[PDB]
């Protein structure tokens with residue numbers, strides 16, 4: 001017998017306010033930051049790198065190429081460095097989940113730091129594709145850590161960032177091609193996916209790793225709500241880690257029992273869910289107060 | 299245990315010609331059909347999907363959507379239907395493996411039928427992502443089978459293919475999102491990987507199931523040759539899901555050959571003494587295809 005009374009946003013809200021739902025995991029991608037003006041750094045932003053004649057377009061995000069020729073990456077980083085950092089209604093919805101004791105973890109494939117600006121703490125977060133929040137000297141014997149303020153000053157001054165201690169390259173803690181996913185992802189995912197009562201999957205197409213396969217690590221009974229412009233994750237039998245196990249999203253089949261798709265902008269979906277839960281005024285008041293503070297320090 | 303004398307194409311060829319190597323498994327993907335003009339149906343084909351008013355781009359390959367609205371799929375099938383079916387050097391290299399009693403199985407993730415055109419038979423093949431070669435009525439109680447010539451005529455005439463028995467939808471035997479991997483795959487994979495002496499992995503980045511799994515099903519002693527345009531796990535960690543070891547101090551059984559699958563197979567054919575047979579086979583088969 002399935003846990004949701006019906007496969008609708010209304011059924012998820014009732015489940016969230018039941019004793020059965022204590023621990024929520026959020027999986028978030030580029031779709032939660034587009035309303036904050038953060039480009040989807042995956043899906044034409046290369047068309048001002050003429051002077052660099054890259055050997056292939058993706059070389060700019062490949063660790064071995066970066067370490068030999070870091071200048072293209074830092075030129076692009078200046079061009080695309082966000083003009084302001086104003087988290088969205090969706091980011092503040094996750095802050096409410098934390099305040100209400102429901103947030104087990106926010107897994108993010110975003111690098112923009114908006115989860116932290118919205119008030120999620122390191123312990124609440126798994127930055128599965130890394131983050132601009134910190135940067136490190138690349139020299140194995142040194143690994144000196146630098147804050148974003150330091151990296152920003154290097155980016156805007158068009159000075160290739162070098163370590164103060166050893167003068168090696170300093171790289172933002174974002175995952176390049178040819179690097180591993182962060183240690184923190186592997187640690188947290190083996191424990192969190194045992195304890196999860198609800199997966200809230202927002203603003204991700206579920207095409208890139210780890211989220212494309214990670215959805216299949218949830219217990220088969222755990223309800224999953226996708227808030228996104230379109231249905232995503234119906235990828236079986238191609239992307240599940242276990243052959244013959246059907247862990248991909250199923251909104252549409254005869255056997256659908258636990259997956260709900262709410263189609264629209266992540267902000268409007270989060271407002272809709274907040275409204276059902278009786279949290280709409282709290283969420284709007286939170287966004288008003290936080291946005292007002294960000295504008296004031298402008 | 300090290301079955302290769304050396305981690306080179308020359309060491310693999312010597313091993314293949316030795317009594318120890320009787321049973322070769324090929325894992326082949328989109329990289330073996332690109333030189334034949336077959337698009338990689340996975341990896342800008344999302345651009346002209348706009349015109350179908352799909353609820354999400356992948357709906358065109360999803361079984362529940364297909365059964366309700368088959369017209370977009372069959373319209374794209376007309377657009378992307380190959381203009382010619384000329385198997386590659388790599389396809390004909392696997393035909394030589396069959397003829398010379400070395401081929402245990404060709405596992406393909408390709409749907410283009412070029413393995414069959416090259417002369418691999420059903421018994422030689424596991425079409426792990428299915429195939430356009432046959433189509434079936436989708437009604438559980440009917441399942442009338444249709445050949446590609448029948449499906450092609452429906453696709454080009456822009457007539458939704460309907461069963462001549464029951465008028466249900468007729469679907470190509472390709473794996474849509476929402477379907478199982480083929481019965482044939484589950485049967486063969488549990489037996490073949492006990493008997494395999496050599497894995498020949500060609501034109502696949504091992505990014506999706508079942509190849510992501512199959513790569514590690516061989517005995518730990520079984521040598522593995524990768525012939526591929528790009529290094530194993532190039533787009534790691536964003537598109538990859540044991541794993542192959544060409545280069546570490548512990549490397550003992552994995553060989554990489556980086557380049558076009560055709561050029562890799564010609565190189566290996568050279569060391570086997572099969573190059574003239576292979577070129578003559580391609581010439582004679584392509585000549586016959588052009589004549590018809």
Ligand SMILES: Cc1cn(-c2ccc3c(c2)CN(c2ncc(Cc4ccc(-n5cccn5)cc4)s2)CC3)c(C)n1
Pocket residue numbers: 041042058061076077078080081082111112113132174175176177208536537
């Ligand atoms: C399947 C696949 C994966 N990838 C892939 C892999 C690695 C990376 C990318 C994409 C894209 N990357 C970037 N893009 C633009 C960048 C400039 C930038 C972004 C943010 C900030 N920022 C400062 C403070 C807050 N945010 C400043 C500058 S960094 C990060 C590496 C591709 C291309 N396809």
Ligand SMILES: Cc1cn(-c2ccc3c(c2)CN(c2ncc(Cc4ccc(-n5cccn5)cc4)s2)CC3)c(C)n1
Pocket residue numbers: 235238239339340356359374375376378379380409410411430446472473474475506
């Ligand atoms: C992880 C993942 C999986 N997938 C995925 C899943 C299912 C399918 C696809 C891709 C691609 N599909 C297709 N592509 C083009 C097609 C037109 C076409 C192709 C061949 C011929 N042909 C006639 C004779 C010989 N070949 C005629 C028309 S059918 C088949 C279903 C994605 C997108 N990501």
Ligand SMILES: [Zn+2]
Pocket residue numbers: 137138139142143144163164165166167168
């Ligand atoms: Zn240093």
Ligand SMILES: [Zn+2]
Pocket residue numbers: 435436437440441442461462463464465466
């Ligand atoms: Zn029928």
